[PDB]
Amino acid sequence: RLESENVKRLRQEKRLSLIVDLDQTIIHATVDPTVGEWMSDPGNVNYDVLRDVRSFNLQEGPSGYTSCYYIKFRPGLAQFLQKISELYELHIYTMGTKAYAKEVAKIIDPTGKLFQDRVLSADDSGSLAQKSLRRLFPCDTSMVVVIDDRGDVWDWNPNLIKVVPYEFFVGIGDINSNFLGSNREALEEQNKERVTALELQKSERPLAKQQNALLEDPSHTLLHNRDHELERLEKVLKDIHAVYYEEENDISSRSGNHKHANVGLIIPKMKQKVLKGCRLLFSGVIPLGVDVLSSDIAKWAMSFGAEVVLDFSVPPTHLIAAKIRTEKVKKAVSMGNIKVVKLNWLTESLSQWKRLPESDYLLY
Numbered sequence: 001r002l003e004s005e006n007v008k009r010l011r012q013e014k015r016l017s018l019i020v021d022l023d024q025t026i027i028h029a030t031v032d033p034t035v036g037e038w039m040s041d042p043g044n045v046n047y048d049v050l051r052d053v054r055s056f057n058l059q060e061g062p063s064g065y066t067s068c069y070y071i072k073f074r075p076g077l078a079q080f081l082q083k084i085s086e087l088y089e090l091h092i093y094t095m096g097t098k099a100y101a102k103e104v105a106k107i108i109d110p111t112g113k114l115f116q117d118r119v120l121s122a123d124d125s126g127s128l129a130q131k132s133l134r135r136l137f138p139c140d141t142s143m144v145v146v147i148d149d150r151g152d153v154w155d156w157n158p159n160l161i162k163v164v165p166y167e168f169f170v171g172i173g174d175i176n177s178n179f180l181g182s183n184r185e186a187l188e189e190q191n192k193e194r195v196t197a198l199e200l201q202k203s204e205r206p207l208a209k210q211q212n213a214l215l216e217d218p219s220h221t222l223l224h225n226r227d228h229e230l231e232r233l234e235k236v237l238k239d240i241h242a243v244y245y246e247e248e249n250d251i252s253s254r255s256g257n258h259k260h261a262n263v264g265l266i267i268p269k270m271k272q273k274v275l276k277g278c279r280l281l282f283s284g285v286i287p288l289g290v291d292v293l294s295s296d297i298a299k300w301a302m303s304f305g306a307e308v309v310l311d312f313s314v315p316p317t318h319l320i321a322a323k324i325r326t327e328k329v330k331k332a333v334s335m336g337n338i339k340v341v342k343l344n345w346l347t348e349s350l351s352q353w354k355r356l357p358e359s360d361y362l363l364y
């Protein structure tokens with residue numbers, strides 16, 4: 001069959017498989033018409049950083065509602081995809097529509113060389129709330145790595161490399177997130193909701209409002225290129241690849257090629273070094289009434305080796321606090337030997353695969 005033969009082929013090519021999210025992983029998209037105006041004006045403070053933005057029109061829904069999408073490609077993307085395709089067979093897996101995914105692929109991959117037809121979208125993935133490795137590799141996930149800005153859609157799968165969400169168009173989120181986590185609504189209800197959100201973004205012009213506020217106050221320019229995430233990510237993926245093929249060489253030779261390596265084992269071993277020895281207590285971060293140990297932030301932290309505790313019975317190493325005026329903070333301070341830090345210490349450390357100095361994240 002095809003699946004078992006693809007695994008064999010990849011090993012002969014000495015490659016792995018990479019599932020690549022679009023929105024806020026390798027692109028950021030908006031329908032704010034402000035972008036088109038700024039792009040058309042060489043004199044605009046935002047023009048220079050918009051020069052590489054590309055756009056397309058999509059007609060959407062029963063009524064053929066039409067929007068101009070503006071796409072910012074994350075810095076270094078062309079180079080990143082070229083280099084990483086040497087090591088990984090690339091797939092796209094997005095919660096956007098098939099039409100959207102195809103429009104983006106036409107721009108990043110015009111001749112089909114990088115992704116060919118390996119493009120999964122909301123239309124054909126099987127779910128509007130979660131993604132699954134099994135949609136592509138039902139029987140054997142040992143060679144597949146994921147890059148995605150969201151861990152919740154993957155249930156914090158051990159094959160996931162969560163990336164820093166790309167936010168170039170300041171204040172614009174993920175325009176394709178509208179149906180994450182939820183039940184399946186009637187198609188009529190889905191289209192009403194999307195048209196509504198798009199129309200709202202067009203009419204409110206959040207970019208214009210934010211830019212105007214800054215000017216009314218380089219620091220006055222809204223948009224900037226300050227993202228270097230793909231340079232970091234390249235190194236991680238190159239490491240995973242090299243560790244896999246060294247372990248594969250060892251395991252397969254010792255087993256008469258009956259056993260093999262597994263990135264799902266390799267990746268957690270890499271991650272668990274980062275916050276090894278940390279025991280985290282959260283204060284005012286998880287909402288009252290929400291289960292802490294199954295929360296996204298707890299799962300993210302535990303994937304990087306941190307323990308999470310719920311009280312001081314065994315004193316934590318860190319108190320991750322959102323508000324300063326709590327008995328947890330008072331107790332932590334009065335106890336001593338506990339570092340009290342903003343949430344940012346944790347999210348930025350996890351993001352950089354590197355425990356950052358706590359002294360840089362104190363509360364006051």
Ligand SMILES: [Mg+2]
Nearest residue numbers: 021023024149
């Ligand atoms: Mg995304």
